[PDB]
Amino acid sequence: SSDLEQLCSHVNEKIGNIKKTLSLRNCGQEPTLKTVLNKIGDEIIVINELLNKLELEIQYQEQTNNSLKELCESLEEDYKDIEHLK
Amino acid sequence: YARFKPVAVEQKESKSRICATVKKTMNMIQKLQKQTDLELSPLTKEEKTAAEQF
Amino acid sequence: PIRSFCGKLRSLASTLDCETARLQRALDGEESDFEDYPMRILYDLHSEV
Amino acid sequence: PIRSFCGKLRSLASTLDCETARLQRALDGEESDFEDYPMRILYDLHSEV
Amino acid sequence: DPIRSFCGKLRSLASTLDCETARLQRALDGEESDFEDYPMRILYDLHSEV
Amino acid sequence: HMEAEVDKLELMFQKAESDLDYIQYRLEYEIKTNHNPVTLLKELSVIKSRYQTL
Amino acid sequence: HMEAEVDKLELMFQKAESDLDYIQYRLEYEIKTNNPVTLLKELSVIKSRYQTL
């Protein structure tokens, strides 16, 4: 790495570091960004509750497919019973 | 969604399997009603539910 | 470690942005830097001679 | 001289694409490669032992 | 570490060889969808520019 | 513009990383929750040696 | 699909290049419808002779 190149990288780092601290100021001050940022942040809270609901609905869905299997089982016993006999 | 996708098809099994056992258990009874006499009707709640199995 | 790449990439972009803009203007006769500075160094060169 | 860069960049993408996909699946119990192959080498290892 | 550190690099070249040979076949065959779907989306952006 | 494009690419990479980071975080959570090929290799060395010296 | 994203980036660069390429092409066309170089060499011959004299 040359003395020239090393300078450039010093520059880009100062430049880049500003641009980041810039967007940090913009997004935390300017209103139009600040809403769309809260709109996302709010819509995260809901899409989080939508998960908990999907969680219970899964551990419910399973527990019926469990019963809806355990029924189907007993129901091929009482048929193979009536299939053998009559 | 991947805790879901199987439970979703292992229902169709248990469904489309029960729906096969009862259709068979039903035709013995419509063979054995024919062969000798008697009667009945499914009466609403029963035929309602038959829509589900068809 | 990520941005470190992009930072370099970015600069090549910023450069591409900035210089394509001005070079068009220069081609068109705007931007002023291109008829203003060569003057100033030509006038220095004159002053030398 | 353009693509030569991007080609490298691209491969890092393709990789990022492909592996993020499968690793999720693997985490979830799909994708099959991850319970299938360690079996096959564990069974070889057994056959050695 | 210096063991896997090698293989890790080797491995990635494999995973790449795996993944891309697969899809490129599909793409050749008309499946995989990424190859007729994305060029669309960037061609449609390019159109929108024009 | 291209700078803007790049800003996106960087943004994507950052996501990919926290994506990977999560997957890992979870695997680690799984492992620490319930309850060893490593030592098994050494032992398979211990025997292959212990044996063929004998 | 970052590969897709990259496909775009590469597309952009290729544009930027043919953009630059045009600008150049025009400038070259401009000069053809019509220099400080030799002026530097001449300005050395004088500075030399005065200092020799």
Next chain:
Amino acid sequence: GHMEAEVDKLELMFQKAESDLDYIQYRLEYEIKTNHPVTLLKELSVIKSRYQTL
């Protein structure tokens, strides 16, 4: 050899992967050869300039 043998396999696989890729390519080339965006980019530059000059 032993691991040497394993490596012999790996090399063999790679060589396959290559001729695999090589075929896919060969076919694509065949498909295109049967009937005979690049220039479109160059054209899209000349106008985006002329707008700016005028």
Next chain:
Amino acid sequence: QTLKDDINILLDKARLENQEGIDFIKATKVLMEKNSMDIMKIREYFQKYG
């Protein structure tokens, strides 16, 4: 947004499959009672005939 759509959309298909399930078992358990009489009615018959 599209993510909160899908994550919602899915939840719906599961709310259903727990339902389309939770009344099948009952919709089936009524044909059970019907076929249960219909045998007991056939059985009571064939023992006597009259």
